[model samples]
Target: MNLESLLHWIYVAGMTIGALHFWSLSRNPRGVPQYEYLVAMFIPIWSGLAYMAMAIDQGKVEAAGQIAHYARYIDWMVTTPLLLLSLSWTAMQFIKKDWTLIGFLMSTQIVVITSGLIADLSERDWVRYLWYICGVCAFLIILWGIWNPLRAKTRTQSSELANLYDKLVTYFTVLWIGYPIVWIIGPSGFGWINQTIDTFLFCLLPFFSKVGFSFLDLHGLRNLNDSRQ
Candidate 1:
């Protein structure tokens, strides 16, 4: 199999394992909400199915003289919003649920991913950069929401939850920055890296951002529960 195919298989395996692991964790909810576990579990399950689609050669498109795996964008369009929802839920655990804020976060995330897909599909450098800029602007709004309003809301919660929120946000912010950086350097942008490397980086980012981040969030939530007992 070629490198891309191999990477697809690896993604399928990784996400499947993540799904199973979270499934097992969901069985013992402890003090964490059942829906939280379900959300965490579903992220990997959805991503695994998307990867399976790509593995079977069903989710790619030719754009800008390079193969663009549109499936990843589809995966992000769904998974990224869920990721924000999960984090937002944690931040609002002690406060009244602000559906307005949550809605804005998810919608802006969609804009970011959609803009990225359009940028990837564009053949002209200027057009591609224009969309990339729009996506980046949307991403900045997300960061501001996370660090400002979300973080501020967390402060009203217990010290343990606040600490956990800080940890998750820090980990999330650092890892997420890698996505746009990879886009700029990879075949979709400047061609500083080939498709193989681009695929590898994309896979790595999702694994960590989705699966890895969930693991950390659930573990921290469990600890928060233990402290309450």
Candidate 2:
């Protein structure tokens, strides 16, 4: 109907294509594990469902004088941690697999997303900004862990794996920053951008960050496996 609804459908279609692509890739799997493909496939599957919910005018609430799509936050709550797991698992693939570190990263990520939702729901300016700050701080911790501990773990593996990790981290970190930026400027925060533009940006960001990143990740892992054989 409207631009926003149209955008949601477009996202749904994009994610459907993404899920199918991963499904096809899973058949061969090259050198990547079956689980990797499944995770990759589910990222888009979950996101597509969220977008579909929002498109039909469900999962929305009034917050901070704007319509907040809690479905998007819910979608991120699951997918972001999954994304972290996918990347972290790759880094520690050759190592003992630090479940503790992975747990900490995932927990911190939840804090970040929760703070964001709280920030959106708060009507008071101070409360909104405070939650935003909390989310940003949590995000910084995640970044530090990614570049420091996670990157270090990757180095213990082959150079190719380390290189792929670096690329993934770079793409991930840069794209993730876009989320905070959009939040601060869009209808949820400063209202510099309208809901339509905000929705459009959000759609594009997840499509690339989740689906695009998975494709890069799986392909890289396959190449790494090929090199090993």
Candidate 3:
């Protein structure tokens, strides 16, 4: 009946829509960075909700009854799948084995979900924080790896697809990294810091990546100069 519930609902709804987008794109990634680009949409989408839900927990607004049920639903069904999928994508890039990535994503997700259910049912704060910290560390390390590679001149020696893929991963990584750092700083106001991060991630980094991919995609991503419509 308040803003938190309203916001969480909005977040989950958006995630469902974005997941549908990924499903379609995965089926047919015909043109120019299709699969990664499609999946990239969810980075900004679901991350916002994941953090929002975490922040909502900080507010302590009655985690029982209907609200609790909805909370569990999004945590188990919506957010968990997205997180696991993103990790699966990352794992594929590292391992280069499609079947293995699929297997790991499925099995790890099931385990995470089942374990989380048990934890939630037990209602232990420290246990929740332990799980949360594990996730946070992994996300941070991946982000660090991405942005750090940008300055290296000979960082990527792979094919064009691999290079472009790295750029996209770097973009998403930096975006997520920006907020947690600001949050860790224990700043008075956080969103501006976070929004600045988003701006860099969405606006600046995307622009730069497109420029790189324009030349690098082998006529994949179109040039920014050509505008007919």
Highest-scoring model, lDDT: 2
lDDT of 2 by residue, 100-156 (tens): 765677788867787766665667888967877888887888778766765444465
Q: Per model, state how many residue pairs clash.
A: 0, 0, 0
Candidate 3 residue spans exceeding 4 A from truth? 1-29, 32-61, 64-97, 101-122, 140-158, 178-229
Best by TM-score: 2
Local accuracy of candidate 1 as per-residue lDDT tens digits, 94-124: 3345567656767778777887666656768
For candidate 1, give the lDDT of residue 165. Answer: 69
Alpha-carbon lDDT of model 1:
0.68
TM-score ranking from best candidate downward: 2, 1, 3
Error of 1 at 74 (Å): 0.6
* Alpha carbon RMSD to native, model 3: 9.9
**Model 3 per-residue lDDT at 16:** 55
What Cα-based lDDT does every candidate model obtain? Answer: 0.68, 0.69, 0.44
